[PDB]
Amino acid sequence: ETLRVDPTNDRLSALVEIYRMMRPGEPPTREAAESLFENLFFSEDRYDLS
Amino acid sequence: AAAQVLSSVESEIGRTTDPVRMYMREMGTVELLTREGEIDIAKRIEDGINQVQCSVAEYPEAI
C-alpha cells in the first residue's frame, strides 16, 4: 500500500521530494539535495549519538 | 528553465511565508553571462549616454 500511494519512481524523484519537504519554496537540484542527504545523516561530525 | 521552476515552486509552497525563499526564487530565474554579458550591458549603457549627450547638444538651451 505504501508503494501504491508513493508516486516516486527512482532515487532521483525520492531525493527531489525529500529536498522539497526539507526546505520548500526552493527549486530542487540533484547536487544540493544529494549533499544535504549525505550531510544530514551520513556525516560523522554531524550525526553521531554515542 | 524558468516557467517550470516557478510552476514547481508555486505547486510545492504550502502557504509558506519565508521571504528568503521568495527572494531566491525571484533571483534564481536569471542566469549568468560571464565575460560576455556585462561587456554588452556596459556598451549599451555607454550608447545610451552618448544618445542623451547628442540630444542635449541638439538642445542649445542647456548649453
Min Cα distance A29 → chain B (Å) is 11
Q: What is the resolution of this structure in A?
A: 4.5
Q: In this structure, what C-alpha cell is assigned to residue A42? A: 551520513
Residue A31 CA: distances (Å) to CA of A6, A27, A28, B7 = 23, 12, 9, 21
Min Cα distance B38 → chain A (Å) is 26
Q: Which residue of A has its CA nearest to B28?
A: A27
Q: What is the 3-state secondary structure (H, E, C) of A7-46?
A: CCCCHHHHHHHHHHHHCCCCCCCHHHHHHHHHHHCCCCCC
Which of A17, A26, A30 is the mutation pick for testing B, counting most B CBs within 10 A?
A26
DSSP B3-63: HHHHHHHHHH-SS---HHHHHHHHHHSS---TTTHHHHHHHHHHHHHHHHHHHHHT-TTT-
**Interface contact flag, B28 A20, Cβ < 8 Å:** no
Q: What is the DSSP letter of A2?
A: H
